[PDB]
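G., before I forget:
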Amino acid sequence: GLFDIIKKVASVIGGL
Amino acid sequence: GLFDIIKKVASVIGGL
Amino acid sequence: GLFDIIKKVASVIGGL
Amino acid sequence: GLFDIIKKVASVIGGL
Amino acid sequence: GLFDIIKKVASVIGGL
Amino acid sequence: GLFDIIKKVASVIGGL
Amino acid sequence: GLFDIIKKVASVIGGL
Amino acid sequence: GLFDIIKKVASVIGGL
Amino acid sequence: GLFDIIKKVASVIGGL
Amino acid sequence: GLFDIIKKVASVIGGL
Amino acid sequence: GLFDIIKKVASVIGGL
Amino acid sequence: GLFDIIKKVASVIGGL
């Protein structure tokens, strides 16, 4: 409605 | 409605 | 709406 | 109504 | 209405 | 109306 | 130490 | 130390 | 140290 | 040691 | 040491 | 050492 704040953090470290 | 805050953290460390 | 702030941080490090 | 003094304040300090 | 004094404030300090 | 004094303030200090 | 997050909201509506 | 995030909101609406 | 993020929002509306 | 294999992951997903 | 394989990841995904 | 395979990653995805 007024604010639609979508914060997505996707941290695939993997590998190593 | 007024604020639709959507915080998603996905942390697939995996690997290792 | 009035503010649609979409902050995506995809951080696939992988490899290594 | 002779004096229809209307005061409205909406302090939508959401987020953070 | 003789005096229809309307004061409206919307302090939508969202985000951050 | 004899005096329709309207004062609307919209301070959408969003973002940051 | 590691994160020192300080959020302060002061909301002196007053007046009115 | 690492992150020193300071978020200050001061909304002195007053007047009105 | 690594990030010193200082976000200040002073919003004195006053008057009206 | 012959094989001093060291793996370290720090995932300081703070903030938000 | 014959093999000193060192893998270090620092994913300091702060802020937002 | 015969094989000092040092791998260092610092992904300081701060701000926003």
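Residues 4 and 10 of chain F are 19 Å apart (CA to CA). The two ends of chain F are 42 Å apart (CA to CA).

More on Monday.
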